[PDB]
Every structure is written in C-alpha cells, then in structure tokens.
C-alpha cells in the first residue's frame, strides 16, 4: 500500500477528479500514467495530478 501527501489543494475541473487539500494523505490505487494518478481519500476516489503530491513514505 502506498500513500502520497498533497503539496497543494487540488480543485477538480472535471468529474472523476479527486479533490484534496494541502497535507491530505491520499492512498495510491494506480500511477501508471505519469501525469494522472488514481487514488482514494476516505470514500472519495478519482484521478489527480502527480505533480501535486509526493511520497508519504
């Protein structure tokens, strides 16, 4: 199981994009695309920009 922490808040522009705030710890589900990663934050799930997070371990 891998996690990433948000370096900045991310405000979705399209459906399917996971909203988050600086410091939120997101669970990685997929990171095949170097630009858009897929993660889980509580009961919310979606894709987000990889350049918005960094390893949380």
């Amino acid at each position: 199981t891998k996690f990433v922490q948000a370096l900045f808040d991310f405000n979705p522009q399209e459906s399917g994009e996971l909203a988050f705030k600086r410091g939120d710890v997101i669970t990685l589900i997929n990171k095949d695309d170097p630009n858009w990663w897929e993660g889980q934050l509580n009961n919310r799930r979606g894709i987000f920009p990889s350049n918005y997070v960094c390893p949380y371990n």
Partner: peptide
Amino acid sequence: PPPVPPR
C-alpha cells in the same frame, strides 16, 4: 501550485 497537466 503548478499548472494542472493536460487532461
């Protein structure tokens, strides 16, 4: 914050 990547 960096610009969001092309969707």
